[PDB]
Amino acid sequence: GRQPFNFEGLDIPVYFIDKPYSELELSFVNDDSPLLFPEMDSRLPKPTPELDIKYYSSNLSSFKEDTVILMRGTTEEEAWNIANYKTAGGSNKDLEENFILSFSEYTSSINSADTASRKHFLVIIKVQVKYISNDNVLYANHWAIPDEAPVEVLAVVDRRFIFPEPPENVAEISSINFRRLNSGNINVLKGRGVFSSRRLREIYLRFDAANADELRPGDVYVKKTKFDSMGYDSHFYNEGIGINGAPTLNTYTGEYVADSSSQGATYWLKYNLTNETSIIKVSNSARGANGIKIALEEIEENKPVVITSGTLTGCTVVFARKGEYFYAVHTGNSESLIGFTSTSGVAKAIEVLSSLSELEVPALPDVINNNTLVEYLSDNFDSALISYSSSSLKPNSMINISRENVSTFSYYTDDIQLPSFGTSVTILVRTNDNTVVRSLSESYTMKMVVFNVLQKDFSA
Ligand SMILES: [Cl-]
Ligand SMILES: [Mg+2]
Ligand SMILES: [Mg+2]
Ligand SMILES: [Mg+2]
Ligand SMILES: [Mg+2]
Ligand code: NA
Ligand code: NA
């Protein structure tokens, strides 16, 4: 093989070997650990908040000499070279040699560092602001640093989890939940509340993903590569959510179904679907739509897939089938734009649906509203479900037509006593030699309980 790198002679204040869950409820998860999630291990220095880094970098004359703390997932060899040469890219060339630029990207996102370092190495550095920039990064919360820039290495953690394979009833109930899902029974997700996570884990399934947002006029962004451990694609990220921002489209595995970012979650904070379940979270874009297209023949036996839209409080979720492909689109806005979702949001959803289905956008009326979405879906897809919020006060939100191939679920109406929220989810399961596809939309009221539902099957 290749000689193991020996870190003992290096200048590393904090160096240790990370233990996976299986070596410490998740006693069978041998390729992940709680090092960074949900709480960053107390041995590790914490990164500088993204907003503070942006503040320093935006006032460079005032803070060029000050430092920030950043994280990175790297290989064994990269981590050793960073710690040995004390430069951002593990280079021993002098910075001056560039002026007679190669860059490495670090992150302020704990979840991003978790994703990148799992099964590899975590490196934490302190670096002066004059060496960082984010002008050309593709991933959220990333900062490029010249490979030759000096850094102070604060921690290196070996997260390769090289350990002999493992030979309140949370584990047992979660295994039953997996068996229920894996049978193709949508009832496992009924009534147990909303779920979402900001975690990023690559799942087995590749799918087309698209984004249309008013921040980027004149373009629909299309991603056909896997959602992988490099980080959070900035097109599927919303810097305005909370403090460090949040992803608007991410995949994770079912050992965590909801985390503390899921507004209103209950049952799925406690129990899970095991890490054999693959979950795709599709949220709205800041001012527009995110969508995915799944090839039903690529769902694999004993690897069920769950799509969740998170907590619905005004946004529109579309599930649809055309041929051998399933579509999920979530449109709306995070900027409290009254009337956007039932008008511009519909237009953005149609842009995404047309892009994913490889159709030219059809001719649309001058006034685009939720009825327009019903018509578009009816004419261009085999079957569809719209889950949406309507009020007699906002006429554009009201759906007053019907099409035989389009179901609609108003998870909010004026008849609802707040507080309330909606959910909309789909399961895709290869069982009995076919791909079962079942969708479920719910309204929750009041401890929140479901009082209104629509269940739609998209399989034969
Ligand atoms: Cl991953
Ligand atoms: Mg990283
Ligand atoms: Mg490695
Ligand atoms: Mg129950
Ligand atoms: Mg949510
Ligand atoms: Na183990
Ligand atoms: Na050294």
The separation of the N and C termini measures: 50 Å
Relative strand content: 25-35%
Order of helices and strands: EHHEHEHEEEHEEEEEHEEEEEHHEEEEE
Task: Name the CATH superfamily assignment of the largest domain.
Answer: Cytotoxic necrotizing factor, Rho-activating domain
Count of DSSP-assigned helices: 8
- The CATH C-level class name of the largest domain: Alpha Beta
Shape: globular
What is the CA-atom radius of gyration, in angstroms? 23 Å
PDB class: toxin
Keywords: toxin, CNF, cytotoxic necrotizing factor, deamidase, RhoA modification, RhoA activation, putative ADP-ribosyltransferase
Assembly: monomeric
Entry title: Crystal structure of domains 4-5 of CNFy from Yersinia pseudotuberculosis
Explain what this protein looks like in three dimensions:
There is one protein chain. This protein is of the alpha+beta class and 460 residues long. It has two domains: 14-158; 170-457, Cytotoxic necrotizing factor 1 (CNF1) (4-Layer Sandwich), CATH 3.60.100.10. The chain is built from eight helices and 21 strands. The chain has helices spanning 50-58, 60-63, 76-85, 110-117, 170-182, 267-270, 344-356, 370-380, and strands at 14-17, 67-74, 103-107, 121-128, 142-146, 152-158, 208-213, 221-223, 237-238, 246-247, 249-254, 274-282, 287-295, 305-308, 316-322, 325-333, 383-389, 406-412, 421-431, 434-445, 449-457. The protein has a seven-stranded mixed β-sheet. A six-stranded mixed β-sheet has the order 11-12-14-19-20-21. A four-stranded mixed β-sheet has the order 1-6-4-2. The modification Cysteine sulfenic acid (-SOH) is found at residue 315.
